[model samples]
Target: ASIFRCRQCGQTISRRDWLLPMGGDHEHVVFNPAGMIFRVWCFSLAQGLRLIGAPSGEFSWFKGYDWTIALCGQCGSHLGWHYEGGSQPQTFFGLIKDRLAEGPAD
Candidate 1:
């Protein structure tokens, strides 16, 4: 997370590869000041970013898919970049659905 930092506050966020946002209870990782992000294998993907860091063992997004999306839950920011593999179509849809779960909040 060292490459990105919050513009609102001049804090050292990019000091670690995986630094938890202090005082943030949402557990969401913001990829850049643009918005939040979902990391896959520590790499940021645009097509399937919705599945990034999806709560381990959680069925929030569609199954049979592998993608991740970066989002902002607090302000309803639809930051892009989601990637996926395999012959599963629902994968991306599931992630989209999970994103919808956050409603307009994300």
Candidate 2:
């Protein structure tokens, strides 16, 4: 697969990494507090991430990665949430599939 681009601003953000799986697969669907559904994919790393709010995991989906909302750095669109695993370099981004495009912005 090609590098994933932001659906809004069309800026490159990430590519698929084989060992970047959250559990067993790269795709996951979760429900937020408001019952809003989100289908996201976890990547090993992401660039130009606009993170917001303090990192927390009080009601998180992962195993306390101190999740925080991550926005698109180029257009400030809601991409997904960033995760922080303190001891290891497991910090990464779970990008919303809906906000991603497969090809270049052009």
Candidate 3:
């Protein structure tokens, strides 16, 4: 198990959470015609990722998956999006790269 902290405030997100430790490939990258690129990392479970605001459009890759902004509950920093429903029965968090610092918390 490893620790992950918020990039803005060093708020610890996980002491030992079920993080999806894997490398990124083409499937992990989301390219938008609006010029936004997201390198999303999936986690089977994220302890401190909070969902806020109404969910937006359905996920293109996964039908019925609603994408919503997920923030750090402690510092209110945008961490990523929490995906609910779709092909998979389990919900997962798609954490943004560089938004989370991997190491021991301060």
| Best candidate (score: lDDT) | 2
* lDDT (10s digit) by residue, model 1, range 50-74: 2346433233222333444445433
* Among all candidates shown, the one with the greatest TM-score: 2
Residue 15 error, candidate 2, Å = 1.0
Model 3 is weakest, by summed lDDT over 10 consecutive residues, at 18-27
How many steric overlaps does candidate 3 have? 0
Candidate 3 has what TM-score?
Answer: 0.73
lDDT of 2 by residue, 8-48 (tens): 88877887542266677788999999999999898878876
Which parts of model 3 have CA positions greater than 4 angstroms off?
Answer: 15-17, 21-27, 59-61
How accurate locally is residue 74 in candidate 2, as Cα lDDT from 0 to 100? 87
Q: Sort every candidate by TM-score, greatest first.
A: 2, 3, 1
Candidate 1 lDDT for residue 83: 33
